[PDB]
Enzyme design. Structure first.
Site, PDB file in Angstrom:
ATOM      1  CG  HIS A   1     -59.916  57.740  86.483  1.00 33.39           C
ATOM      2  ND1 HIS A   1     -60.847  57.977  85.506  1.00 33.39           N
ATOM      3  CD2 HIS A   1     -58.752  57.449  85.852  1.00 33.39           C
ATOM      4  CE1 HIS A   1     -60.274  57.847  84.311  1.00 33.39           C
ATOM      5  NE2 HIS A   1     -59.013  57.529  84.499  1.00 33.39           N
TER       6      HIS A   1
ATOM      7  CG  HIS B   1     -55.186  60.136  84.812  1.00 29.83           C
ATOM      8  ND1 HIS B   1     -55.477  60.753  83.614  1.00 29.83           N
ATOM      9  CD2 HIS B   1     -55.771  58.913  84.758  1.00 29.83           C
ATOM     10  CE1 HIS B   1     -56.205  59.939  82.865  1.00 29.83           C
ATOM     11  NE2 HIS B   1     -56.398  58.820  83.536  1.00 29.83           N
ATOM     12  CD  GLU B   2     -54.733  56.145  87.940  1.00 26.68           C
ATOM     13  OE1 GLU B   2     -54.027  55.704  87.006  1.00 26.68           O
ATOM     14  OE2 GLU B   2     -55.964  55.898  88.048  1.00 26.68           O
TER      15      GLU B   2
HETATM   16 ZN   LIG Z   1     -57.423  57.128  83.144  1.00 24.92          ZN
END
Ligand SMILES: [Zn+2]
Ligand SMILES: [Zn+2]
Lengths: 165, 238, 137, 238, 165, 137
Positions: free
Chosen positions: B215, B211-212
């Site tokens: 981003h 997830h990170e």
């Molecule tokens: Zn997020």
């Protein structure tokens, strides 16, 4: 009026069903926008004549970004943004690299939305191969943890999950 | 294998892949040992008490944190022994993500998306932007400023707050204007969140790191969306 | 002008063997956007099918320059993807055609996306016209 | 058994438990056959095109309904044959809810919570409030105004919008000041909503009717909360 | 800031985990408030001397509401609100009668929150005892529909679930 | 002054029979708030227990004026609730005490709520002091 309040970035980052909430209209706006920003970068390169920092030559640094942005280069050495190459890279970064897709690739159990209000938080230690492996995560193959994601199960694998407060 | 060497926190520095460093955008700060696990990617096994001037206090805020949960503990990630464990943990997760076609691709895209050189006041000149570099100290006391794309760092006061930070510029919005910028990820391989099913499960930490990293990809390519750009979805009521 | 031309369509009885072909053209399969440096770690040619009244589902795909293949868990033991060394044709074979198969088959191709990624997402930049397959009694 | 008689839409009226009626708070309106399935509880097998002056149009609004889903069809609940089916369906669901200890209790509480008599301009005098009555036509043309607590009525334009309506007073807020008031529930036993599980399931229609009956309980006892009193809950972000 | 926007009424009506979102403070405020409203009704009764409508006598109508509100009556015939009897009735109407509890009583599968953004909507017909019964709902006993809520399963019991659009 | 006094506590060996009693007092069980009209359709006396480090869980309850009872699905074949006609005492019996039982037992009573409702919600206005039960080897 009841419901949820979600963010574009977060929604995009997670993908899955969540992403359908974004309407076709807001999607094009975001695409074209970033399309134009890239053209701006292509324009800044076409204009570069010198370079500070001492890193390398304007030749090198220009090739580096030609590569980063998938820029098309012509006879004059002028860079331009390719619509198709742009769509693919945009698509790649916003529709393909998603948490949901990564889940399909790790074969693990996971939430179905980026939103979560649970207060369950555990301490772990993945370093030891007996607890967590690069290929099986917590769900060790040829083990009881193998199926039903028993390895991700707080109760069944309570050893690898010290609960906090 | 994504990470060749196998680092051990106690390993002696060399100013190349193991070294103490300083971040330009922090001003006065004690150097912190870091590890270069891959091209353009470093790991700082320390509590992030410097990316934000208002940190350093590994203590609970005045009143309360406006979130479902929050964990605090100032002795977390303080013993060289723990730090080594942290380093080993982030390393494995990287290998885990790398171990997939999707993860290999993303990691390629990240290492490939160097922050743009628009740090110059004059249009016909390319210049690095200070926020996108770090100063690597050499065994002799020198220091060589290096360009990087991603830094994994330990959590701040709130141990369970994971996030993809970034030093903003003065005027322009690097993560939104196409330029992109060095991404710092506050993260911990020692904790995870649970969730309910038919059944009490736990999220696989690699999925969180993914997830990170996702981003970060957006940000490195300056195509991120203002985190404050939210909208609303109504329920079917009854 | 990229082009995909499926073929091998028609009908057969339960148990008969079907061979499908797809002529790709216009794709350099030279490591897609990344570049020649990726000639071997990128690209995919595969097959998808849509059961009348059902979703478009993935079947299998092979690598344009390697021997890598990927099948929907559901079908490694009922299908087989092949490719001509030239890298300009894709073949989906299957013997003992069930009625479960009756549907429209489409071939896909993506310059820079592994056959596995093509199958799991799923994703593909180019699609074929579609060829109908239907079994009987 | 909660509902003694067994009604059949085509049954001839008697002005007691089967009759055409009019609602005072509707003004000019054609009478509509209704059925008294229990004390204080009636059922109107018709499309609610009168509780709200702005209804009557079984058609889709100008642009779009600000909700995930919405179904429209103006021929729904128009044939005596369908109406009879509707009546049978609501009847069974009631029996279903009644069939439980919790449902028996709730139903007792509802039948027991008659709307308060504060309809008088003078403090030392009790008076019924018009919104809490209905006019029951007698076989001879008379009409007797009757006190009731709950009315189940068919859906409006949007067939799948279930709701617990209520005729508000001029000044005071009956559902929030303790007084309470006749509740009308737009509902249909012929449709239901699905939801996902490990798996595509469907909500049991009795549970939906329960939800509405629950709202009604709150309202009949004037202890409901302004539907616009919402607040916010933050996620754990990452 | 991401998250959800929920209503008090709706949250209370549904019960379950949802109800925990309401903090102890907003709970007391709501209780005391409605407590006072009842006292107001008790006061209006104690003062009633006449009655319009022609229904019955002030005696009857007063007893009716004494019963509705569980009012305590003394020697003078004056009504008063009993704290304990109030808490129980408030509790009964807001904590016990909930959608969630009703679900525990019907032994059926159901959503875990009042919020839903699904677009799946089906047509049905519960009248025929072959499709739906008062005691088993859709999940007919001593049938395949019996366990696993197969009766509520759209796929398995597709006959009793015509999907719309 | 409502009061609940559990008893029968102590310890036993796996298999031994335990009898628990609870003296209720201060409850008229005359149809609770609704009134005498509900004497027979209301009220409940039952048992709950808390396993050290576990949630308070329901066991069983009987009606104060009827013979209605309700047991946690998990225990109809290992426990048995009883009541004295007087309606001033409640008894929980069990033979062959397992170690699974070791825990603290509490008796509850509600004027107007059926024994079933008392068990499923769960709910009860009055609780007992609590009596500890622990089995051995
Ligand atoms: Zn997020
Ligand atoms: Zn509602």
């Amino acid at each position: 009026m009841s419901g949820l309040e979600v963010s574009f970035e977060e929604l995009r980052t997670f993908g899955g069903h969540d992403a359908k909430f974004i309407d076709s209209l807001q999607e094009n706006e975001f695409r074209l926008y970033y399309y134009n920003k890239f053209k701006d970068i292509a324009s800044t390169l076409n204009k570069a004549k010198s370079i500070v920092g001492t890193t390398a030559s304007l030749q090198y640094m220009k090739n580096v970004f030609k590569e980063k942005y998938l820029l098309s280069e012509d006879t004059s050495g002028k860079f331009s943004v390719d619509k198709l190459k742009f769509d693919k890279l945009y698509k790649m970064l916003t529709e393909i690299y998603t948490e949901d897709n990564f889940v399909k690739f790790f074969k693990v159990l996971n939430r179905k939305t980026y939103l979560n209000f649970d207060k369950a938080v555990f301490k772990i230690n993945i370093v030891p191969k007996v607890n967590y492996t690069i290929y099986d995560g917590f769900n060790l193959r040829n083990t009881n943890l193998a199926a039903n994601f028993n390895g991700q199960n707080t109760e069944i694998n309570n050893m690898n999950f010290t609960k906090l407060k | 294998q994504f990470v060749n060497k196998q680092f051990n926190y106690k390993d002696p520095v060399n100013g190349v892949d193991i070294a103490y460093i300083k971040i330009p955008n922090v001003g006065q700060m004690q150097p912190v040992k870091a590890f270069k696990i891959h091209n353009k990617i470093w790991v700082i096994p320390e509590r992030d008490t410097f990316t934000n001037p208002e940190e350093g206090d590994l203590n609970p805020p005045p009143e309360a944190k406006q979130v479902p949960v929050s964990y605090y503990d100032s002795t977390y990630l303080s013993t060289d022994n723990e730090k080594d464990n942290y380093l080993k943990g982030v390393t494995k997760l990287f290998e885990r993500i790398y171990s997939t076609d999707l993860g290999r691709m993303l990691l390629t895209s990240i290492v490939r998306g160097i922050p743009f050189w628009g740090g110059s006041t004059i249009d016909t000149e390319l210049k690095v932007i200070d926020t996108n570099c770090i100063n690597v100290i050499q065994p002799d006391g020198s220091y060589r400023s290096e360009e990087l794309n991603l830094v994994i760092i330990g959590p701040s006061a709130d141990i369970i707050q994971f996030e993809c930070k970034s030093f903003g510029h003065e005027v322009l919005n690097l993560t939104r204007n196409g330029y992109g910028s060095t991404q710092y990820i506050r993260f911990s391989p020692d904790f995870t969140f649970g969730f309910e099913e038919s059944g009490k499960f736990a999220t696989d930490p690699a999925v969180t790191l993914a997830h990170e990293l996702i981003h970060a990809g957006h940000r490195l390519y300056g195509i991120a969306i203002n985190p404050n750009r939210v909208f609303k979805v109504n329920t079917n009521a009854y | 002008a990229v082009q995909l031309v499926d073929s091998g369509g028609g009908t057969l009885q339960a148990g008969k063997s079907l061979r499908l072909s797809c002529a790709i053209s216009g794709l350099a399969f030279d490591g897609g956007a990344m570049g020649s440096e990726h000639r071997l770690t990128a690209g995919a040619m595969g097959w998808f099918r849509q059961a009348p009244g059902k979703d478009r589902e993935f079947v299998a795909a092979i690598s344009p320059r390697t021997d890598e293949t990927y099948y929907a868990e559901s079908l490694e033991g009922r299908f087989s993807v092949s490719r001509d060394a030239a890298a300009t044709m894709v073949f989906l074979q299957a013997d003992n055609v069930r009625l479960d198969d009756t549907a429209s088959y489409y071939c896909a191709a993506d310059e820079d996306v592994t056959p596995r990624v093509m199958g799991v997402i799923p994703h593909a930049d180019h699609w074929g016209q579609g060829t109908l397959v239907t079994v009987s009694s």
